[PDB]
Design a protein around this ligand. Structure first.
Ligand SMILES: Nc1ncnc2c1ncn2[C@@H]1O[C@H](COP(=O)(O)OP(=O)(O)OP(=O)(O)O)[C@@H](O)[C@H]1O
Lengths: 394, 390, 401, 401
């Protein structure tokens, strides 16, 4: 996909410069740090209208696929203007005073420009440093502008939009994925039934160990949470065993083998369909100890304790909720993006900080991750990927 | 189910006494009627607090199961007190002056009383005379309460809470039912799978017309819109008949019969899963002429015009959204209630007026229907069901 | 005046066409449900008003609009270079091409351009009065006039779509105020006629100076004047007649006095009837529906601003607002077809909301019998509204593409 | 009517007392700044209007209020058990005890209680018109009527304190509109008089039927009628006079015809003067101040609604809004003391804002000469306002605790 490669600031706040070269994979930033992340976030999102609130000269923005974004803010006739220039050369220019009035046609122009040049192909998920209090304030896609406006009023009109997925959205997306996976299993069920019929139909004309294998597969299917709609496999296997014992042709062996293949392929397709959900749930569960997240077959999705009582996701504290959202954002079930985190070391025990980056990389999404940290526990074991930001003060 | 049998209005508005005869089936109120409808809805829905806004003396409501309810607006020391007494002597008293302020604890105690003696087992879908403007206003449970407050400020405090379904609600309910239907079909395939194998396994140990029947079943199954995830029954039939041409044991005949029965039972359960939806859409499409309400598979629920282009349900006129809601409210998938329709003949061409009650009864929901219409065309033919109040 | 002659829609909502030829007097429109009748009335209202800025909210290709005086307004919506535009073109050829996105933004300089265009040309002077199908509930929501209706228009447009024409139908408050002004103008006219008649009567007899049957006739005229509601501020005619009769009885020029009094009384009475013709005809036409009471006016002495309200047989009066919705609808519609209104085209959505069957049988009869000459267009589903008017029925059968 | 007789304040602002005895006709109040005169006028205005909800914003103990007809409204504010309450008590004894916090919350059922109280008793039917001292800037900020003033009241109360009484003083638009209605009412009276005179004239001549000097007198009366602005819709008197004169000249009873016409003309002229007496007296009293132009009216050649505005000696007219604040103040105050208003008590804070010294010398003279009988209360510091009214001067000397 498209990942950021290099950011070249010039005279931000008219006092200091900076020039950073990135890696496509994980990026640990240690050392105006939050300001740098905001600049990166506002470029990748394509929300260029915020850069008429920052004093600078020139900001190059080089991607990995060769794309280039050169923003430039100049003051002519005591009037400020922003001159965004891309790789192909389509320079755009609007007046600053237009932007400030709109906040309290211009926005329509920006989206048409960005869409035409294929610039918003990759989104960016922003995790602010004040998310802990922010979710409490939203206790009560509809919380994407209101909460953003609230945060911008509190911390400044340069703050990028708040896109990070709330736990309610995570639960609903898990539910929809479960529905789609179930439908895929049903389609596979139909195809296997047709295929099994024709198979035996032909080799019928052609003229204990397999029983044990089918018994193992049947009890595995009955011991599978995903089979919450049908668990009669042990019963029908014993009926087949009763049928065999009362009375061996070659076709009978073929019937045995086709049953084993049908069970195994149904099981394997189940694993493939639920691969993403199970990998995400296992990665989360490698941290949690008190309970474990799971599902029940409008199939419920929630936490499950060893006592057997379920609970909604909102019972979780702030520390667990941050872990939930970030690990979701680096999973394949999310949206193709660049994970922009301000401070992950909030309400986290030291053990989870030792392995946070490990789990996020081991999910193997391929998405670019850029973290700015001050703790050495977040960054330990990843010395080769650390980038030190030392801005040159002029 | 529970239905109404007898109401005894005594000196409402101080110059009007009336009693009425009911049945448990369709009772077209032909011909003060509007007031009677409101009094039926407020007793059924358990909203007894609303009676503090009516100048009356005493009303008795008699059900079909023997349950009887008595409301008395007594007067003591220039202050009105509503008393509600059930058949088993369940008396709850409250002053009217206290009630008026709270509307603009008491309601909490009232709903506790309703739930404890279970007076809210059956609700009532009120179809008022102003549905067109209100539904468009909502279109722009939450809709129900909000619109009710707006309505009651417009036409009176004693107006029953508007809770008849809206086309948005109808669309969402249809979508949810399709989702549940897909899950049911999927479960049946799983069941059919394992069971068919053991039948064939038994057929191993047991020692052209059928092919044509299988081919017809495959053609019907493939050409069915309900098969949005597998549609190759014709192809697998071709493979099986090719094997016949290549190659008669009784196990071969057993294989043929098990295939035939599998297809027939799959189709039968497929039909039966889409029964509460297909009956409803067949009733609707019997009225509509240049359009057709259909479904497609994430599922899509919209009108299908003859060119093939679609459109959402919100693009319908003011006289077609009404027909959808009234027909849905008398459907088995609709929530069970004693539907009270006020003037069904609003914005309906006279042909639909003749054929409305016929369809609403032929769906056979087993629900009491009470309509109050000034149009003879609505209730023509049904002279027997007429109940003159006079 | 100006009446519609032919409407030719084309691919409204990109699915169906229609072509209707109208009559100048009355147009009863009946058709199948959902076949686009309310859409047709909305198109007519937005064209005749000249409010062309609403047509950037409806998907079509071309809509011709033909008047009776020869005008041929051709609106056309094209999406040239993937940009939609509306090009309204009149008979003389002044096309006014604007971009659709300008109009939609303006609603939530362009309006001045439209206003300059319509005033310069012959697009106004008609001002089609639209009676919506939800007027019964709409008046409850406003408890508005034919020109103070920005609030009610915005509310209705938000509820039913941004193509909905302005709400022009006269509210009962406006009808009452217009009735007061007409009464005031009629009274001044009676006073002006009184002054001129007094001057003429003086000079006439004075110069030409140098009977039982006529006495009975003058007595009949005097008691008629006393039995006239319009003479509420003066009813002394019987008394003065008896004084003149006493003068005659105690004992040429006397014949001259008799004939001039008869002419003066008859011309004053006839001018009274002519001046109050419109008001009395409208009140009688309304009273042909009402049965419990009757609407009328009072010229009570010792106070001014003469009241207009309902009058019961018991004698107690009541204001117009006492009327229910069913009576109020009759009031407003019959005003719009009366000569007291404004020269317009009466656009009614459903003339049967909150109406008993008896009133539906005779609504069109009274509306036509007022003989205003204004064009009336009703969309009905009941056969009682349209009965006895088979020649004026219009069947809407939209041809599908 | 009801006029104040005696005011006995007690511990206003919890620091000083005062006790003033008033006159029924006119009360000139003179003192110094900080002696609590504007506070006294506010107290009087809020009591007479019956707007008792404002008295939960002033710290006091007891305020007696005495009329001329014997009423003895005693309001009292006590902080019993650390809770403040207002107990207004009238002569008959209907105390209405409410808690202060209810009133303050309501501003930002109580009003219904006040309305029921005032209607049952004899507290309303007065509606004191209050002219604030800051009216000059207030009208400029609003560039309103005596009953459509919620917006202006809230603005003024926010600027000068939550004890400020409602703004009832008639805006010039209301004065102009009331003048139009009064002209209309006068016209209706003329029309009623026209009908009665026509009947009376008939019987008169008819009986007495069975010269140079009188012709000159009738000619003078006829030219006077033609030279009268009130006859803006009938000015044919000269023509008809010449026709009768021509009839006489070409060749007893003729003398009788002359005298009855003269009596008819004189009574018609006198009733015209009587009907327009109030309007002409008010306009003349205003015109005794103005010098650049003069206020008058025009009966147009248009359809109706005769214009009333300023008229300059050049002949060009102008609307009333052309006037500055200084002229506008004279207009409003002189209206409030005129018979054309509503029976009330004229409450003026300072009758010298934006007024030249000459106009201050003669304001009260015109105001008294109108002879309305209404009570006038002015708070002045100039000796020119109070000159010639020594017997009516009131000295405010408050008694500190
Ligand atoms: N936004 C839209 N997009 C597409 N088709 C639409 C849209 N709005 C309306 N239609 C269709 O165009 C026609 C317009 O319906 P309309 O409300 O004008 O019908 P009507 O015959 O006047 O109805 P009724 O007599 O019931 O009041 C209908 O066939 C409707 O389905």
């Amino acid at each position: 996909i498209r990942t950021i490669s290099k950011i070249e600031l010039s005279k931000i706040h008219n006092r200091y410069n900076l020039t950073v070269d990135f890696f496509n994979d994980l990026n640990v930033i240690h050392g105006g740090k939050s300001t740098l992340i905001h600049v990166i976030a506002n470029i990748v999102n394509g929300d260029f209208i915020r850069f008429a609130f920052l004093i600078f000269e020139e900001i190059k923005a080089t991607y990995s696929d060769g794309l280039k974004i050169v923003i430039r803010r100049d003051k002519i006739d005591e009037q400020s203007f922003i001159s965004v220039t891309l790789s192909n050369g389509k320079y755009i220019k609007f007046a600053v005073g237009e932007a400030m009035a709109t906040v309290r046609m211009l926005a329509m122009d920006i989206d048409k420009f960005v869409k035409e040049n294929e610039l918003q192909k990759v989104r960016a998920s922003y995790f602010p440093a004040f998310r802990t209090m922010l979710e409490a304030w939203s206790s009560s896609s509809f919380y994407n502008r209101k909460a953003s406006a609230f945060a911008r009023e509190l911390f400044g009109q340069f703050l990028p939009s708040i896109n990070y997925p709330s736990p309610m959205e995570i639960e609903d997306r898990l539910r929809e994925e479960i529905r789609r996976a179930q439908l895929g299993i049903a389609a596979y069920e139909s195809r296997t039934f047709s295929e099994s019929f024709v198979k035996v139909f032909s080799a019928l004309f052609d003229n204990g160990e397999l029983l044990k294998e089918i018994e193992g597969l049947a009890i595995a299917q009955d011991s599978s949470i995903k089979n919450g709609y049908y668990a009669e496999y042990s019963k029908v296997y014993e009926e087949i065993r009763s049928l065999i014992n009362r009375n061996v042709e070659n076709s009978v062996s073929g019937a045995l083998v086709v049953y084993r293949d049908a069970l195994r392929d149904r099981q394997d397709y189940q694993e493939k369909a639920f691969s993403e959900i199970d990998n995400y749930m296992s990665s989360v569960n490698s941290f949690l100890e008190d309970k474990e997240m799971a599902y029940d077959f409008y199939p419920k999705v929630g936490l499950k304790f060893p006592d057997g009582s379920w609970s909604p996701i909102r019972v979780l504290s702030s520390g667990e909720r941050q872990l939930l959202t970030m690990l979701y954002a680096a999973s394949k079930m999310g949206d193709d993006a660049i994970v922009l985190i301000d401070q992950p070391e909030i309400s986290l025990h030291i053990d989870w900080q030792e392995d946070l980056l490990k789990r996020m990389l081991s999910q193997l999404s391929g998405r670019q991750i850029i973290v700015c940290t001050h703790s050495p526990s977040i960054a330990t074991g990843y010395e080769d990927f650390m980038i030190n930001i030392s801005p040159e003060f002029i």
